[PDB]
Write a structure and sequence with these properties.
Structural class: mainly alpha
Number of strands: 7
Radius of gyration: 20 Å
Distance between the termini: 28 Å
GO molecular function: FAD binding; oxidoreductase activity; protein-disulfide reductase activity; thiol oxidase activity
Protein name: ERO1-like protein alpha
InterPro entries: Ero1, ERO1-like_sf
Strand order of the largest sheet: 2-1-7
Order of helices and strands: EEHHEHHEHHEEHHHHEHHHH
Shape: globular
Number of helices: 14
Pfam family, one: ERO1
Helix content: 55-70%
Largest sheet: 3 strands, mixed
Membrane topology: Peripheral membrane protein
Number of domains: 1
Bound molecules: flavin-adenine dinucleotide
Amino acid sequence: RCFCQVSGYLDDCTCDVETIDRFNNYRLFPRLQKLLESDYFRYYKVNLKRPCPFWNDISQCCEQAERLGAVDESLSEETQKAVLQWTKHDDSSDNFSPEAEYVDLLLNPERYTGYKGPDAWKIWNVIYEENCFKPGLCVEKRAFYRLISGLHASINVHLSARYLLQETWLEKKWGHNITEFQQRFDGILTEGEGPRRLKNLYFLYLIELRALSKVLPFFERPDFQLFTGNKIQDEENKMLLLEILHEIKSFPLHFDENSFFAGDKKEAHKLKEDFRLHFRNISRIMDCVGCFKCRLWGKLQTQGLGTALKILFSEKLIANMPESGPSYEFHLTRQEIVSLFNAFGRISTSVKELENFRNLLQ
Ligand SMILES: Cc1cc2nc3c(=O)[nH]c(=O)nc-3n(C[C@H](O)[C@H](O)[C@H](O)COP(=O)(O)OP(=O)(O)OC[C@H]3O[C@@H](n4cnc5c(N)ncnc54)[C@H](O)[C@@H]3O)c2cc1C
């Protein structure tokens, strides 16, 4: 049995890795991955064109890095129709020119982009700088650190496992680059920092995994619908998602009643609000990122994380779920939902990746 303590003071999870490795890598993976190619999930809405609101740049750019960081914006004629049906259908419900257009994630896997050096380092510094809570002055929450660190790790993991290994003037080979993984993660080479960083990825992973288990209800109500064009998979996909959320629930994970997601009024609230606040800044930050694929996955993976927390805060709010009625109390836009499973999906992939790495490193 796993066990997570998120009091805010010292936050951590005592939990066997083989347990998660085994669970995630074999129980969950092929099916989630299946779901993430589902029509409903390959297409994410995003405004990639907002300008940086904290400084200027584009100075210097390297030429191939803009070539790697460029989002393939492509979209089939049919899909083009298909999104309106969504906008439309989606309009007629809970709904509190957006140069946000839908992007195809399968056309845009997260891998090595050549994004590096000062421009990246700055963004990271600024993201971590956002760790700042009322316990009115800043306190750092360890949770935030570990969350963000886990995310950063998942990424450096993806770029590691999905590196552009060879670029003949003809052919391009993408794959696992051990030396990178190792330079960035090996315990010795990093004086134990990498392992920590990996322990942090897992933290994140579990958080999102809990966030999923605690959100199962919202999908259980048969007025909820993964609306796309057809109805068959819309239901096939519906049960899919569900048996996944069911699997997540199966996983023996427990939290200390101490967790600052407990509704101690103002504390829980202030905190929740401190959070949603911080992630908005973060999203804003992504608007200062020139690796457009990086920027995309940034937005995505963070919205997802915010959403996860949103759930993790709405313990109660969800516990009184209109089992037949439509959920006014709590809600999730398509945008958020896509981001939720997707964010979880890259962390889920990252975890998988670590195993490949173990296996190659033998
Ligand atoms: C939002 C975003 C998305 C990105 N997407 C991609 C991508 O898809 N492909 C790609 O190649 N690059 C991507 N990058 C750049 C990438 O994350 C690295 O910064 C880059 O590859 C350079 O590596 P580095 O070791 O010099 O920098 P980093 O690894 O980012 O180092 C920055 C500093 O923080 C420390 N650090 C590094 N990782 C962690 C961690 N997990 N927890 C705590 N501290 C850490 C480092 O040791 C160093 O002190 C992205 C960056 C951002 C900000």
